[PDB]
Amino acid sequence: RWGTIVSRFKDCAALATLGHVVKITGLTIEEVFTWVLQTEVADELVKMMKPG
RNA sequence: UUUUUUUUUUUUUUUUUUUUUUUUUUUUUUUUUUUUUUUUUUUUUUUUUUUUUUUUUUUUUUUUUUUUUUUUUUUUUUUUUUUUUUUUUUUUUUUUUUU
């Protein structure tokens, strides 16, 4: 698995960004989504939260 | 084009640890890096006290003149051929951006 780890979650850095900002603040995920105050960021989050 | 911790094998997280220990203390004594004795200006022969003086003197003044380290005369941008006056310009362009 040395060398092959860079294949996992390739070109998917925004999910890791969301996880890091959830863990580094101590807030729940709903509060992290609540504290967003821009329409562009909210639209990207909505497009990133496709259910299936 | 695609990407976007010059992050990541999994584990881990004191550049901690045999055990025992803790004045880079200690033989016992001792405790002026004091002392023969007796002395105590790194004073003194007696004289003496301007590292003063022959006398005379006293601008490290002076021949007499003189007194811009001025001057042929003419002059007075260390200006000028005329023309000119971004040490601008082919056209097109205008992140020393980009699969």
* CB-based contacts of A44, cutoff 8 Å, min separation 6: A14
> Which nucleotides in chain B lie less than 7 Å from some protein C-beta?
2-5, 7-10
Q: Which of residues 1-52 of A touch strand B (CB under 7 A)?
A: 1-2, 5-6, 11-13, 16
Instruction: Cite the beta strand spans of A1-52 per DSSP E.
Output: none
**Technique behind the model:** cryo-EM
Query: Position of tokens 């639209």?
Result: A43
Q: How far is the CA of A28 from the C1' of B97 (A)?
A: 40
* CB-based contacts of A9, cutoff 8 Å, min separation 6: A15, A16
Quick one: resolution in A? 3.7
A31: alpha, beta or left? (left if phi > 0; alpha if psi -120 to 50): alpha
- Please name the nucleotide lying closest to A10, CA to C1': B3
Tokens of A27: 């807030």
Residues recorded for chain A: 52
